[PDB]
Amino acid sequence: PSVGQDLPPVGGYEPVQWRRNLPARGFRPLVYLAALCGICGYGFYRALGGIQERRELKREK
Amino acid sequence: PREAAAHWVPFEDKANMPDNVPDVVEVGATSAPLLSASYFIGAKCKPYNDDFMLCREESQGSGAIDCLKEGRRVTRCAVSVIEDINKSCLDEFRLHWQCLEQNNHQLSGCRKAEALLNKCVFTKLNLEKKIPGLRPDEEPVFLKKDPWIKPAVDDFKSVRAYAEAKKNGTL
Ligand SMILES: CCCCCCCCCCCC(=O)OC[C@H](COP(=O)(O)OCC[N+](C)(C)C)OC(=O)CCCCCCCCCCC
Numbered sequence: 001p002s003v004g005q006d007l008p009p010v011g012g013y014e015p016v017q018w019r020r021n022l023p024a025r026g027f028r029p030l031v032y033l034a035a036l037c038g039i040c041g042y043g044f045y046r047a048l049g050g051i052q053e054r055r056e057l058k059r060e061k
Numbered sequence: 062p063r064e065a066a067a068h069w070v071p072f073e074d075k076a077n078m079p080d081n082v083p084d085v086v087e088v089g090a091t092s093a094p095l096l097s098a099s100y101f102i103g104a105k106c107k108p109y110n111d112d113f114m115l116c117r118e119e120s121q122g123s124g125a126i127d128c129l130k131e132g133r134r135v136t137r138c139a140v141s142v143i144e145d146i147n148k149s150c151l152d153e154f155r156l157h158w159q160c161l162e163q164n165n166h167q168l169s170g171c172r173k174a175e176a177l178l179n180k181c182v183f184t185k186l187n188l189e190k191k192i193p194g195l196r197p198d199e200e201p202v203f204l205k206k207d208p209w210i211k212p213a214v215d216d217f218k219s220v221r222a223y224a225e226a227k228k229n230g231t232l
């Protein structure tokens with residue numbers, strides 16, 4: 001006889017996760033490069049516009 | 062032309078200009094009034110300033126003593142400009158150069174008092190502020206709308222006066 005022991009459930013446990021859970025996340029790399037070139041080029045727009053404005057200010061002074 | 066360095070000692074001389082040179086009124090305006098009225102003293106006194114520098118060119122190394130007679134007239138006519146701009150718009154001239162006292166005397170930071178002053182002087186002293194060397198299809202920079210370079214803080218008196226001049230319809 002064996003009373004008072006720990007035993008598994010009669011239906012068993014549910015299955016655990018032992019596979020690798022590494023899902024690929026992010027946009028495509030061409031999306032990040034296109035976004036990079038867009039952010040950069042808009043920055044160059046504002047920067048070179050400000051340089052020309054500062055040149056006209058230097059003319060006035 | 063070169064800066065004083067390594068223990069320079071300032072000295073003044075209590076002495077007088079000689080008899081043969083007549084007396085001349087000197088300008089008492091300060092850097093923000095002078096930088097304010099710069100374009101209008103350059104508009105009224107173009108040929109006198111030109112006569113002075115052209116004389117100083119033609120008599121090389123003479124320099125000081127031989128074109129003194131003309132450097133009299135440039136100081137006199139610029140004193141005439143600043144007396145007239147005082148008596149015309151003391152308040153708005155004052156608004157302009159008190160704005161220029163802050164912001165490193167940058168002309169970029171005081172557009173809204175500058176518009177008031179330019180209107181008041183063109184209306185009454187009838188001198189116009191222009192930038193030469195500027196070929197057409199090139200907008201002058203103190204006329205443009207939405208410049209890239211805005212000041213850090215608009216001063217309060219000139220924003221209030223600019224809005225009141227909008228409401229009066231004089232602008
Ligand atoms: C506080 C502001 C922080 C800004 C983040 C720093 C700069 C941006 C870096 C780009 C990374 C990125 O956001 O890319 C977005 C992707 C999700 O897209 P996807 O599920 O893979 O589908 C793409 C399917 N395609 C390819 C077919 C189109 O990655 C992530 O969200 C992972 C979590 C990073 C969270 C960063 C916080 C921003 C909230 C985004 C919630 C969606």
Ligand SMILES: CCCCCCCCCCCC(=O)OC[C@H](COP(=O)(O)OCC[N+](C)(C)C)OC(=O)CCCCCCCCCCC
Nearest residue numbers: 040041042043044045046047048049050052053198199200
């Ligand atoms: C290899 C580099 C190739 C560049 C090709 C891009 C052509 C795009 C056409 C837009 C031009 C435009 O319309 O923008 C003109 C702008 C703003 O000038 P503005 O003050 O508004 O003009 C008023 C004229 N005034 C001053 C006489 C009154 O000026 C620029 O400089 C911005 C150019 C866009 C930045 C491009 C940088 C590219 C990334 C380089 C990474 C190192």
